[PDB]
Amino acid sequence: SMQEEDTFRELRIFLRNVTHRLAIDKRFRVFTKPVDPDEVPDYVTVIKQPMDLSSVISKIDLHKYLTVKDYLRDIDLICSNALEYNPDRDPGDRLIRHRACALRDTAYAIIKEELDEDFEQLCEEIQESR
Numbered sequence: 001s002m003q004e005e006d007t008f009r010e011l012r013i014f015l016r017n018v019t020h021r022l023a024i025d026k027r028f029r030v031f032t033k034p035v036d037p038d039e040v041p042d043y044v045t046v047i048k049q050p051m052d053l054s055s056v057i058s059k060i061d062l063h064k065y066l067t068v069k070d071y072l073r074d075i076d077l078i079c080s081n082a083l084e085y086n087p088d089r090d091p092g093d094r095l096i097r098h099r100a101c102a103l104r105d106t107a108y109a110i111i112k113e114e115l116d117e118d119f120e121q122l123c124e125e126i127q128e129s130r
């Protein structure tokens with residue numbers, strides 16, 4: 001309905017604002033663009049489902065997220081992809097894993113603090129009816 005497209009538009013506005021706040025954080029610069037095969041050739045090997053914050057913005061604009069859970073699944077994908085590509089003890093890996101955990105925890109904490117629980121529930125129930 002008009003009432004439901006309003007809800008989904010508000011969700012999109014919210015998710016764009018969260019994602020922008022993640023994307024401008026210096027810690028998360030490695031997660032802002034897709035991995036370049038030129039700069040990192042063996043990534044396309046290990047990571048079957050690449051994800052990054054620019055792709056999140058495009059999916060928002062494509063109406064691909066109808067719920068916050070849907071969005072958080074892709075945030076979790078950015079994080080788990082980074083843990084898988086960086087399993088070793090050496091400091092390059094440990095630094096990426098730390099930022100990846102911080103990206104995930106930051107996204108969850110912004111949503112917990114600023115997203116109304118009844119709004120996310122409305123989003124869920126509209127989606128379940130489709």
Ligand SMILES: CC(=O)c1nc(NC(=O)[C@H]2CNCCN2)sc1-c1cc(O)cc(O)c1
Pocket residue numbers: 030031033034035036040081082085086088090092093096
């Ligand atoms: C996002 C990600 O998971 C990622 N992981 C890396 N790991 C390493 O470089 C590890 C590999 N093991 C040996 C020690 N170095 S680099 C990197 C990345 C970094 C950027 O500046 C841009 C970008 O698009 C991706």
